[PDB]
Amino acid sequence: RMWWAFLASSMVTFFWMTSVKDWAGVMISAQTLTGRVLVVLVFALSIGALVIYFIDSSNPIESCQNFYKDFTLQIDMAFNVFFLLYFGLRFIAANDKLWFWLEVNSVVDFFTVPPVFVSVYLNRSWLGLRFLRALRLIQFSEILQFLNILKTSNSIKLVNLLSIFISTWLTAAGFIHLVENSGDPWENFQNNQALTYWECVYLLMVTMSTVGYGDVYAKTTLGRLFMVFFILGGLAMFASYVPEIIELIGNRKKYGGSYSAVSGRKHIVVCGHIT
Amino acid sequence: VNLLSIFISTWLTAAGFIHLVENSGDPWENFQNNQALTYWECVYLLMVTMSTVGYGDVYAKTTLGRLFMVFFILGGLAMFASYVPEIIELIGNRKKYGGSYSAVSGRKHIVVCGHITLESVSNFLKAFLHKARDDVNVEIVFLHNISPNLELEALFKRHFTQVEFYQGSVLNPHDLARVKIESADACLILANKYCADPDAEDASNIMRVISIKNYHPKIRIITQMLQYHNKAHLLNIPSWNWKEGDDAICLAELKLGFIAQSCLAQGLSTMLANLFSMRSFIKIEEDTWQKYYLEGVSNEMYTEYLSSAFVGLSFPTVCELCFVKLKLLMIAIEYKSANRESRILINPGNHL
Amino acid sequence: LVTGGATPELEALIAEENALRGGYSTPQTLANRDRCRVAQLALLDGPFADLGDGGCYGDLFCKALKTYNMLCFGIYRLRDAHLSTPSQCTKRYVITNPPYEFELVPTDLIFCLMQFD
Amino acid sequence: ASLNIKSMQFDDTTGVNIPIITELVNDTNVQFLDQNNNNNPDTELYLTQPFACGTAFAVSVLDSLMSATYFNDNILTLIRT
């Protein structure tokens, strides 16, 4: 397996001027319609890239997708072109380039786009950490505020919760799928489990609800370790995140309703000193 | 760290017990009923169990293994029940409104302090955050040392896009730094009109003014005041520069002045209140008094520097020319003299 | 407009003692009385009475400003003046800053600023 | 009252030269008596101009007196005298 090449590429990519910075920042943020449509565009392109990820994950990880062999590879190549241009333009506008070098979106870009470039260059594609693009669905909440669709703050919060939950679900399912399709390096990739991505999603859903059927489960050592870490992270995130938001949401007025007039039945209204 | 260490220690010790029991056998079964589990596999089994997931891929088969697993379930549940309430709801507490305001570039903001309750905030937001107001790019930041109740929280949630709240005292320099009073366009101080001692509350408002001016003397402050005499205390603050925008709005003085001018000419209070208030545009076609009244309500009051073409002409001539030609009514002028400061003159005579 | 032309100097004198003190009349103080006051004028029996019978508001405004230096800035009009049928309602409403082409009725009041006499 | 006295004017001068000492409960309120443009509003109590000039008496010094009395008895016996 050539996972070493793509992993090393992504790992290496992991590690008047002010006028240009400001000019770039004008068309990237939400003050101008250009930045707004750019956000919507990168979101739609991220969704398309995730769909292409699902299609490619239907296929084995160690594939030989040549540039002209499969068109979806070319569309993903274009997706990565747009993403590369986008964060390259965002890079200059950074007031503190160090912090924006250590943001989740930048990390996704480093672990997604250079691997695609290398896969196209060698005409042999490896289904790697391309599922990280799902982390670019949280911005959906903000986008549902840009088009003037979400108005209540509680609705925006609920959409944020749903987006975060879906993103974490899909990302951890992608980790499990990648780990189990391959094998343990110290076992020379011999203990690998044929497991589709949707089976991984179902396994993750069964796990997080503490149901634990056992019909589909982690077998590889890295798979079991990732499952344990996912249980730890899910429990910790639940404990430190659901109390505030949920007990904020799960509140309703006891007597805030309106009277329903029943035909054939008179009624009187009693007010004043009611004890 | 105590929690993490004890949790990891108990996890590893239970995994070791399970490993020892499973790799050995039951002595009554001649050490035959044994299962080969690596220690890390036992760790995985213990964590799968303590999460109440129970995959069933890895489980204890020996009688001693099952017995120890049952006692581990019982002990873990008992320890969790007896331990989590105290420690976790000691740790799972966060300050609701202890944050700091983030100054968004290109967005002005004002800081509102003083008496902040449901009534005062509701009235201020109705007057300020009016729908008919078009160019309102300022963000309102309330700073008050009393956490809001349910109704005030709901009101703040309704205007979440322009209104923020922070729990702090304006007399604390740290709290003044939190709300970024340096970058604030203005500070508005609201008083409670319904109190036993208006003098003490006026003194409190003047204390707040003194604190704000001490922290940043160049900010513009607009303060509500209850009694007329107390305004004198605002002239003892050297930073108070009413020629640069610092204003005291005496509620009693203006209220009873409006009422007295209504006594002199009834309906003047309505005219004045409509002049500086913002009203949504409404169409009335049927011949009623509302149709005529709304046409007058459409007007507002503005200030403008007079063109150089008017210089040297008496006030009546300028006003008449403005009305006949420009379709403007000019009521007052700001006369600046060498002897005295600038003074407002309402309808000066022809001798000016 | 509403406090009777109170000056900051008078505020300082009040603050010095929390009281209003009398003073003997001098030309400088006797010249302080010359400021406009708010008033309501009727159109029944006066120089502008002939303006009431259908006259335009602009003509009344210009005549008042030119002759008496009174600034007319609003109409106080009977609530049922537009109605053709007679009514007993004495209540009036406010029409501030009417246009030039506004038509008057004899039963109207004028908000004006009058010079001292 | 302190600022009211400081802002007075008299016929021969002004009230900023009148010797006044003000009791203050809070240490943070001591800086309010200095109308000079103090660049740092976070200076300690003993470094403020009103405290160094003796024009403000902070009641919090009695807690320090209690601590010193604990660490040395005789000090109190001197101060009271």
PDB file of C-alpha atoms in Angstrom, chain B residues 89-307:
ATOM      1  CA  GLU B  89     -21.848  19.060  39.271  1.00  0.00           C
ATOM      2  CA  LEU B  90     -18.986  20.766  41.051  1.00  0.00           C
ATOM      3  CA  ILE B  91     -17.105  20.778  37.731  1.00  0.00           C
ATOM      4  CA  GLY B  92     -20.036  21.083  35.321  1.00  0.00           C
ATOM      5  CA  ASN B  93     -20.686  24.721  36.257  1.00  0.00           C
ATOM      6  CA  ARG B  94     -19.948  27.621  33.908  1.00  0.00           C
ATOM      7  CA  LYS B  95     -20.598  31.347  34.135  1.00  0.00           C
ATOM      8  CA  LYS B  96     -23.493  32.245  31.850  1.00  0.00           C
ATOM      9  CA  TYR B  97     -22.667  35.902  31.135  1.00  0.00           C
ATOM     10  CA  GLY B  98     -19.002  36.159  32.112  1.00  0.00           C
ATOM     11  CA  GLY B  99     -17.679  36.598  28.576  1.00  0.00           C
ATOM     12  CA  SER B 100     -16.069  39.585  26.898  1.00  0.00           C
ATOM     13  CA  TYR B 101     -17.441  41.573  23.975  1.00  0.00           C
ATOM     14  CA  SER B 102     -15.670  41.093  20.642  1.00  0.00           C
ATOM     15  CA  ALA B 103     -15.298  44.344  18.686  1.00  0.00           C
ATOM     16  CA  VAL B 104     -16.314  43.642  15.090  1.00  0.00           C
ATOM     17  CA  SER B 105     -14.578  46.070  12.746  1.00  0.00           C
ATOM     18  CA  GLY B 106     -16.905  48.304  10.756  1.00  0.00           C
ATOM     19  CA  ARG B 107     -19.684  47.938  13.358  1.00  0.00           C
ATOM     20  CA  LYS B 108     -20.180  50.700  15.906  1.00  0.00           C
ATOM     21  CA  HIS B 109     -21.507  49.781  19.332  1.00  0.00           C
ATOM     22  CA  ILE B 110     -22.875  51.576  22.386  1.00  0.00           C
ATOM     23  CA  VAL B 111     -22.864  50.500  26.031  1.00  0.00           C
ATOM     24  CA  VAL B 112     -26.047  50.785  28.106  1.00  0.00           C
ATOM     25  CA  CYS B 113     -25.787  50.627  31.895  1.00  0.00           C
ATOM     26  CA  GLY B 114     -27.696  51.732  34.972  1.00  0.00           C
ATOM     27  CA  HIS B 115     -31.124  50.390  35.913  1.00  0.00           C
ATOM     28  CA  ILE B 116     -31.591  47.418  33.573  1.00  0.00           C
ATOM     29  CA  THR B 117     -34.876  45.540  34.027  1.00  0.00           C
ATOM     30  CA  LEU B 118     -37.723  44.342  31.814  1.00  0.00           C
ATOM     31  CA  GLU B 119     -39.514  47.697  31.627  1.00  0.00           C
ATOM     32  CA  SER B 120     -36.487  49.931  31.037  1.00  0.00           C
ATOM     33  CA  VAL B 121     -34.901  47.618  28.464  1.00  0.00           C
ATOM     34  CA  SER B 122     -38.227  47.122  26.675  1.00  0.00           C
ATOM     35  CA  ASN B 123     -38.851  50.873  26.428  1.00  0.00           C
ATOM     36  CA  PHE B 124     -35.275  51.622  25.356  1.00  0.00           C
ATOM     37  CA  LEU B 125     -35.335  48.905  22.689  1.00  0.00           C
ATOM     38  CA  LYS B 126     -38.713  50.054  21.364  1.00  0.00           C
ATOM     39  CA  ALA B 127     -37.429  53.621  21.064  1.00  0.00           C
ATOM     40  CA  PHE B 128     -33.980  52.644  19.731  1.00  0.00           C
ATOM     41  CA  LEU B 129     -34.390  49.376  17.795  1.00  0.00           C
ATOM     42  CA  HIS B 130     -37.355  50.633  15.797  1.00  0.00           C
ATOM     43  CA  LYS B 131     -38.301  48.907  12.552  1.00  0.00           C
ATOM     44  CA  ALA B 132     -38.869  52.234  10.792  1.00  0.00           C
ATOM     45  CA  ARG B 133     -35.267  53.187  11.602  1.00  0.00           C
ATOM     46  CA  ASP B 134     -33.245  52.457   8.467  1.00  0.00           C
ATOM     47  CA  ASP B 135     -29.539  53.115   9.133  1.00  0.00           C
ATOM     48  CA  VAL B 136     -28.923  51.539  12.538  1.00  0.00           C
ATOM     49  CA  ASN B 137     -25.491  49.895  12.378  1.00  0.00           C
ATOM     50  CA  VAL B 138     -24.804  50.119  16.122  1.00  0.00           C
ATOM     51  CA  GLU B 139     -24.876  47.136  18.476  1.00  0.00           C
ATOM     52  CA  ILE B 140     -26.307  47.513  21.979  1.00  0.00           C
ATOM     53  CA  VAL B 141     -24.286  46.037  24.852  1.00  0.00           C
ATOM     54  CA  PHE B 142     -25.966  45.955  28.262  1.00  0.00           C
ATOM     55  CA  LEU B 143     -23.731  45.665  31.330  1.00  0.00           C
ATOM     56  CA  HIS B 144     -25.463  44.939  34.628  1.00  0.00           C
ATOM     57  CA  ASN B 145     -24.474  43.152  37.832  1.00  0.00           C
ATOM     58  CA  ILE B 146     -27.858  41.394  38.187  1.00  0.00           C
ATOM     59  CA  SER B 147     -28.539  38.318  36.076  1.00  0.00           C
ATOM     60  CA  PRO B 148     -31.723  38.734  34.003  1.00  0.00           C
ATOM     61  CA  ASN B 149     -34.894  36.831  34.820  1.00  0.00           C
ATOM     62  CA  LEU B 150     -36.845  34.679  32.356  1.00  0.00           C
ATOM     63  CA  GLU B 151     -38.711  37.544  30.672  1.00  0.00           C
ATOM     64  CA  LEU B 152     -35.585  39.658  30.183  1.00  0.00           C
ATOM     65  CA  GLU B 153     -33.722  36.612  28.861  1.00  0.00           C
ATOM     66  CA  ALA B 154     -36.510  36.046  26.328  1.00  0.00           C
ATOM     67  CA  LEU B 155     -36.430  39.720  25.328  1.00  0.00           C
ATOM     68  CA  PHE B 156     -32.663  39.542  24.805  1.00  0.00           C
ATOM     69  CA  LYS B 157     -33.113  36.348  22.774  1.00  0.00           C
ATOM     70  CA  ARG B 158     -35.631  38.123  20.536  1.00  0.00           C
ATOM     71  CA  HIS B 159     -33.099  40.827  19.568  1.00  0.00           C
ATOM     72  CA  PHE B 160     -30.086  38.496  19.663  1.00  0.00           C
ATOM     73  CA  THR B 161     -28.701  39.890  16.402  1.00  0.00           C
ATOM     74  CA  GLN B 162     -28.169  43.411  17.805  1.00  0.00           C
ATOM     75  CA  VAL B 163     -28.379  43.117  21.620  1.00  0.00           C
ATOM     76  CA  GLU B 164     -25.836  41.518  23.955  1.00  0.00           C
ATOM     77  CA  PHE B 165     -25.732  41.304  27.749  1.00  0.00           C
ATOM     78  CA  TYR B 166     -22.887  40.985  30.241  1.00  0.00           C
ATOM     79  CA  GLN B 167     -22.954  40.532  34.016  1.00  0.00           C
ATOM     80  CA  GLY B 168     -20.688  43.196  35.477  1.00  0.00           C
ATOM     81  CA  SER B 169     -20.564  46.488  37.330  1.00  0.00           C
ATOM     82  CA  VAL B 170     -19.746  49.683  35.443  1.00  0.00           C
ATOM     83  CA  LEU B 171     -17.814  50.830  38.532  1.00  0.00           C
ATOM     84  CA  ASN B 172     -15.366  47.933  38.085  1.00  0.00           C
ATOM     85  CA  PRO B 173     -12.557  48.832  35.641  1.00  0.00           C
ATOM     86  CA  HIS B 174     -12.202  45.167  34.654  1.00  0.00           C
ATOM     87  CA  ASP B 175     -15.879  45.040  33.670  1.00  0.00           C
ATOM     88  CA  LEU B 176     -15.424  48.309  31.775  1.00  0.00           C
ATOM     89  CA  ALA B 177     -12.563  46.672  29.877  1.00  0.00           C
ATOM     90  CA  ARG B 178     -14.699  43.592  29.167  1.00  0.00           C
ATOM     91  CA  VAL B 179     -17.375  45.484  27.215  1.00  0.00           C
ATOM     92  CA  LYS B 180     -14.670  47.414  25.324  1.00  0.00           C
ATOM     93  CA  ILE B 181     -15.748  50.841  26.545  1.00  0.00           C
ATOM     94  CA  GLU B 182     -12.791  52.395  24.698  1.00  0.00           C
ATOM     95  CA  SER B 183     -14.241  51.509  21.282  1.00  0.00           C
ATOM     96  CA  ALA B 184     -17.833  52.263  22.314  1.00  0.00           C
ATOM     97  CA  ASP B 185     -19.476  55.119  20.435  1.00  0.00           C
ATOM     98  CA  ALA B 186     -21.402  56.221  23.524  1.00  0.00           C
ATOM     99  CA  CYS B 187     -22.499  55.140  26.984  1.00  0.00           C
ATOM    100  CA  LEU B 188     -26.187  55.499  27.854  1.00  0.00           C
ATOM    101  CA  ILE B 189     -27.165  55.379  31.530  1.00  0.00           C
ATOM    102  CA  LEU B 190     -30.757  54.512  32.435  1.00  0.00           C
ATOM    103  CA  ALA B 191     -32.311  55.367  35.798  1.00  0.00           C
ATOM    104  CA  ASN B 192     -35.350  53.871  37.495  1.00  0.00           C
ATOM    105  CA  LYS B 193     -38.100  56.477  37.629  1.00  0.00           C
ATOM    106  CA  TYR B 194     -39.933  54.654  40.447  1.00  0.00           C
ATOM    107  CA  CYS B 195     -37.858  54.679  43.634  1.00  0.00           C
ATOM    108  CA  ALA B 196     -38.257  55.898  47.199  1.00  0.00           C
ATOM    109  CA  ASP B 197     -35.162  58.145  47.086  1.00  0.00           C
ATOM    110  CA  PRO B 198     -34.524  59.756  43.678  1.00  0.00           C
ATOM    111  CA  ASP B 199     -31.554  61.677  45.111  1.00  0.00           C
ATOM    112  CA  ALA B 200     -29.656  58.503  46.031  1.00  0.00           C
ATOM    113  CA  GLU B 201     -30.297  56.991  42.600  1.00  0.00           C
ATOM    114  CA  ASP B 202     -29.149  60.203  40.913  1.00  0.00           C
ATOM    115  CA  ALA B 203     -25.992  60.042  43.029  1.00  0.00           C
ATOM    116  CA  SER B 204     -25.504  56.448  41.868  1.00  0.00           C
ATOM    117  CA  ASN B 205     -25.841  57.519  38.229  1.00  0.00           C
ATOM    118  CA  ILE B 206     -23.332  60.329  38.781  1.00  0.00           C
ATOM    119  CA  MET B 207     -20.999  57.759  40.357  1.00  0.00           C
ATOM    120  CA  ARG B 208     -21.317  55.671  37.197  1.00  0.00           C
ATOM    121  CA  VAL B 209     -20.567  58.753  35.078  1.00  0.00           C
ATOM    122  CA  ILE B 210     -17.486  59.477  37.202  1.00  0.00           C
ATOM    123  CA  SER B 211     -16.250  55.899  36.811  1.00  0.00           C
ATOM    124  CA  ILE B 212     -16.744  55.890  33.034  1.00  0.00           C
ATOM    125  CA  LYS B 213     -15.026  59.261  32.616  1.00  0.00           C
ATOM    126  CA  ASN B 214     -12.161  58.122  34.852  1.00  0.00           C
ATOM    127  CA  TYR B 215     -11.599  55.044  32.694  1.00  0.00           C
ATOM    128  CA  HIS B 216     -11.840  56.917  29.364  1.00  0.00           C
ATOM    129  CA  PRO B 217     -12.422  60.692  29.524  1.00  0.00           C
ATOM    130  CA  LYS B 218     -13.155  61.109  25.799  1.00  0.00           C
ATOM    131  CA  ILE B 219     -16.254  58.886  25.589  1.00  0.00           C
ATOM    132  CA  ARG B 220     -19.663  60.486  25.053  1.00  0.00           C
ATOM    133  CA  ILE B 221     -22.153  59.851  27.864  1.00  0.00           C
ATOM    134  CA  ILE B 222     -25.925  60.346  27.806  1.00  0.00           C
ATOM    135  CA  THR B 223     -27.458  59.895  31.250  1.00  0.00           C
ATOM    136  CA  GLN B 224     -31.062  59.888  32.462  1.00  0.00           C
ATOM    137  CA  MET B 225     -31.596  61.975  35.592  1.00  0.00           C
ATOM    138  CA  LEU B 226     -34.575  62.212  37.928  1.00  0.00           C
ATOM    139  CA  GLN B 227     -34.231  65.593  39.668  1.00  0.00           C
ATOM    140  CA  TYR B 228     -33.242  68.959  38.238  1.00  0.00           C
ATOM    141  CA  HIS B 229     -30.818  70.121  40.937  1.00  0.00           C
ATOM    142  CA  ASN B 230     -28.672  66.973  40.801  1.00  0.00           C
ATOM    143  CA  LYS B 231     -27.578  67.927  37.269  1.00  0.00           C
ATOM    144  CA  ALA B 232     -25.303  70.475  38.955  1.00  0.00           C
ATOM    145  CA  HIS B 233     -23.137  67.587  40.166  1.00  0.00           C
ATOM    146  CA  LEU B 234     -22.371  66.767  36.525  1.00  0.00           C
ATOM    147  CA  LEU B 235     -20.546  70.100  36.161  1.00  0.00           C
ATOM    148  CA  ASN B 236     -18.010  69.114  38.846  1.00  0.00           C
ATOM    149  CA  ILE B 237     -16.552  66.378  36.608  1.00  0.00           C
ATOM    150  CA  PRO B 238     -13.835  67.995  34.436  1.00  0.00           C
ATOM    151  CA  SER B 239     -14.173  65.258  31.806  1.00  0.00           C
ATOM    152  CA  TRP B 240     -17.873  66.132  31.410  1.00  0.00           C
ATOM    153  CA  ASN B 241     -17.871  68.215  28.204  1.00  0.00           C
ATOM    154  CA  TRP B 242     -21.458  68.990  27.217  1.00  0.00           C
ATOM    155  CA  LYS B 243     -20.146  70.969  24.238  1.00  0.00           C
ATOM    156  CA  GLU B 244     -18.781  67.695  22.809  1.00  0.00           C
ATOM    157  CA  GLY B 245     -21.968  65.622  23.156  1.00  0.00           C
ATOM    158  CA  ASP B 246     -22.184  64.688  26.854  1.00  0.00           C
ATOM    159  CA  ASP B 247     -25.858  65.061  27.746  1.00  0.00           C
ATOM    160  CA  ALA B 248     -28.054  64.778  30.827  1.00  0.00           C
ATOM    161  CA  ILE B 249     -31.752  64.174  30.169  1.00  0.00           C
ATOM    162  CA  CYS B 250     -33.730  65.279  33.226  1.00  0.00           C
ATOM    163  CA  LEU B 251     -36.966  63.289  33.131  1.00  0.00           C
ATOM    164  CA  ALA B 252     -38.951  65.522  35.490  1.00  0.00           C
ATOM    165  CA  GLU B 253     -37.751  68.760  33.879  1.00  0.00           C
ATOM    166  CA  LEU B 254     -38.586  67.753  30.305  1.00  0.00           C
ATOM    167  CA  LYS B 255     -41.828  66.000  31.280  1.00  0.00           C
ATOM    168  CA  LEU B 256     -43.241  68.961  33.177  1.00  0.00           C
ATOM    169  CA  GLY B 257     -41.943  71.389  30.553  1.00  0.00           C
ATOM    170  CA  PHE B 258     -43.901  69.483  27.913  1.00  0.00           C
ATOM    171  CA  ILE B 259     -46.955  69.530  30.181  1.00  0.00           C
ATOM    172  CA  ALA B 260     -46.655  73.269  30.889  1.00  0.00           C
ATOM    173  CA  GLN B 261     -46.220  74.110  27.206  1.00  0.00           C
ATOM    174  CA  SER B 262     -49.325  72.007  26.568  1.00  0.00           C
ATOM    175  CA  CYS B 263     -51.058  74.162  29.181  1.00  0.00           C
ATOM    176  CA  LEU B 264     -50.020  77.219  27.167  1.00  0.00           C
ATOM    177  CA  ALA B 265     -51.024  75.583  23.862  1.00  0.00           C
ATOM    178  CA  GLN B 266     -52.765  72.213  23.995  1.00  0.00           C
ATOM    179  CA  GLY B 267     -51.462  69.550  21.635  1.00  0.00           C
ATOM    180  CA  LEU B 268     -47.887  70.864  21.578  1.00  0.00           C
ATOM    181  CA  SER B 269     -46.623  67.804  23.460  1.00  0.00           C
ATOM    182  CA  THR B 270     -48.000  65.507  20.753  1.00  0.00           C
ATOM    183  CA  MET B 271     -46.362  67.611  18.028  1.00  0.00           C
ATOM    184  CA  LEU B 272     -42.982  67.596  19.767  1.00  0.00           C
ATOM    185  CA  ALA B 273     -43.161  63.876  20.559  1.00  0.00           C
ATOM    186  CA  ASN B 274     -43.979  63.130  16.922  1.00  0.00           C
ATOM    187  CA  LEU B 275     -41.156  65.377  15.698  1.00  0.00           C
ATOM    188  CA  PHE B 276     -38.287  63.376  17.218  1.00  0.00           C
ATOM    189  CA  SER B 277     -39.982  59.961  17.198  1.00  0.00           C
ATOM    190  CA  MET B 278     -39.785  57.529  14.289  1.00  0.00           C
ATOM    191  CA  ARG B 279     -43.057  56.239  12.828  1.00  0.00           C
ATOM    192  CA  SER B 280     -43.759  53.486  10.322  1.00  0.00           C
ATOM    193  CA  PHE B 281     -45.234  54.715   7.044  1.00  0.00           C
ATOM    194  CA  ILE B 282     -48.997  54.094   6.888  1.00  0.00           C
ATOM    195  CA  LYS B 283     -51.455  54.959   4.105  1.00  0.00           C
ATOM    196  CA  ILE B 284     -54.971  56.226   4.851  1.00  0.00           C
ATOM    197  CA  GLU B 285     -57.195  56.979   1.852  1.00  0.00           C
ATOM    198  CA  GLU B 286     -60.678  57.442   3.332  1.00  0.00           C
ATOM    199  CA  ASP B 287     -61.486  61.016   4.363  1.00  0.00           C
ATOM    200  CA  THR B 288     -60.933  60.859   8.128  1.00  0.00           C
ATOM    201  CA  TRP B 289     -58.893  62.761  10.695  1.00  0.00           C
ATOM    202  CA  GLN B 290     -56.231  60.035  10.608  1.00  0.00           C
ATOM    203  CA  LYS B 291     -55.461  60.827   6.961  1.00  0.00           C
ATOM    204  CA  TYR B 292     -54.770  64.500   7.698  1.00  0.00           C
ATOM    205  CA  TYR B 293     -52.939  63.722  10.949  1.00  0.00           C
ATOM    206  CA  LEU B 294     -50.524  61.224   9.374  1.00  0.00           C
ATOM    207  CA  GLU B 295     -49.422  63.823   6.814  1.00  0.00           C
ATOM    208  CA  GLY B 296     -48.182  66.019   9.647  1.00  0.00           C
ATOM    209  CA  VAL B 297     -46.747  63.006  11.479  1.00  0.00           C
ATOM    210  CA  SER B 298     -44.572  62.314   8.422  1.00  0.00           C
ATOM    211  CA  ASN B 299     -42.310  65.243   9.387  1.00  0.00           C
ATOM    212  CA  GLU B 300     -39.178  65.123  11.545  1.00  0.00           C
ATOM    213  CA  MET B 301     -36.642  67.636  12.862  1.00  0.00           C
ATOM    214  CA  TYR B 302     -33.171  68.161  11.393  1.00  0.00           C
ATOM    215  CA  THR B 303     -30.199  70.512  11.702  1.00  0.00           C
ATOM    216  CA  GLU B 304     -28.364  72.051   8.762  1.00  0.00           C
ATOM    217  CA  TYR B 305     -25.725  74.714   8.205  1.00  0.00           C
ATOM    218  CA  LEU B 306     -27.192  77.711   6.398  1.00  0.00           C
ATOM    219  CA  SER B 307     -25.839  78.410   2.924  1.00  0.00           C
TER     220      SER B 307
END
